Amino acid sequence: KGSVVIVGRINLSGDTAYAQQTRGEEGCQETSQTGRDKNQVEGEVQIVSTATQTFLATSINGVLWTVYHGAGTRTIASPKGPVTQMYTNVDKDLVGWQAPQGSRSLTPCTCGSSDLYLVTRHADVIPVRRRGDSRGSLLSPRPISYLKGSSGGPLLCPAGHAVGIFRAAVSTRGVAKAVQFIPVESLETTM
Numbered sequence: 001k002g003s004v005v006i007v008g009r010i011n012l013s014g015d016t017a018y019a020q021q022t023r024g025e026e027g028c029q030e031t032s033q034t035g036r037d038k039n040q041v042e043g044e045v046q047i048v049s050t051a052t053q054t055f056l057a058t059s060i061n062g063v064l065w066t067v068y069h070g071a072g073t074r075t076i077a078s079p080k081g082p083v084t085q086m087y088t089n090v091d092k093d094l095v096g097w098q099a100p101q102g103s104r105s106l107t108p109c110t111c112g113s114s115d116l117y118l119v120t121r122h123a124d125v126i127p128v129r130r131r132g133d134s135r136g137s138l139l140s141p142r143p144i145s146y147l148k149g150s151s152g153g154p155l156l157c158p159a160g161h162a163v164g165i166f167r168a169a170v171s172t173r174g175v176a177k178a179v180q181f182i183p184v185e186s187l188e189t190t191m
């Protein structure tokens with residue numbers, strides 16, 4: 001199987017969040033096969049792809065994290081070739097690689113706030129009220145299509161710290177009313 005490939009990023013650096021593509025589909029396929037990706041990486045949230053799926057990955061504390069259901073055990077492409085996972089936990093649906101040079105990491109949240117914000121692959125910033133250790137409700141439910149492809153993205157607190165990694169959606173008749181996430185403390189213990 002090929003490597004996971006960074007194909008874009010969610011730009012959160014200014015006042016407006018927006019998605020940027022950094023590699024098209026043909027270059028993605030080539031880079032997945034070689035594992036050699038010379039592109040410059042920037043930012044906290046990467047858009048990533050395999051031959052068959054596309055999703056997100058988020059840097060927290062120097063590790064680029066994503067979901068096992070997207071990445072499996074795959075290496076990630078890098079300027080020096082394929083990079084093997086540093087963390088794999090199928091029970092948490094969690095994998096991680098060393099964060100690429102040029103990326104910026106989020107800091108784990110320590111404030112205990114329940115007012116969260118989910119960042120999607122389309123750079124929507126979606127308010128979510130935390131409802132448990134691993135769940136939160138959308139303030140404005142929407143069709144699940146709007147969340148598809150955003151696993152591996154972050155939930156952030158009002159100060160912009162990482163609270164969790166988006167894992168699964170709670171859906172009724174195709175409407176997403178809530179999200180399920182890997183809490184950052186689960187990452188912190190993994191580290």
Ligand SMILES: CC[C@@H]1[C@@H]2CN(C(=O)[C@H](C(C)(C)C)NC(=O)O[C@@H]3C[C@H]3CCCCC(F)(F)c3nc4ccc(OC)cc4nc3O2)[C@@H]1C(=O)N[C@]1(C(=O)NS(=O)(=O)C2(C)CC2)C[C@H]1C(F)F
Pocket residue numbers: 053054055056068069070090092093144147148149150151166167168169170171176180
């Ligand atoms: C494969 C898709 C996974 C499945 C089902 N699933 C759901 O969300 C389902 C739907 C389908 C009914 C919505 N809800 C749901 O279980 O709710 C229940 C309350 C939750 C409690 C159970 C949590 C289960 C889990 F998550 F831990 C999970 N652990 C796994 C571990 C190992 C593994 O090894 C192969 C597969 C695993 N598979 C898992 O879950 C996930 C999903 O779709 N995630 C999102 C996404 O965007 N993926 S993605 O980027 O498009 C893609 C596919 C390209 C990568 C955010 C969703 C976006 F769509 F909203």
Ligand SMILES: [Zn+2]
Pocket residue numbers: 108109110111112113157158159160161
């Ligand atoms: Zn916080």
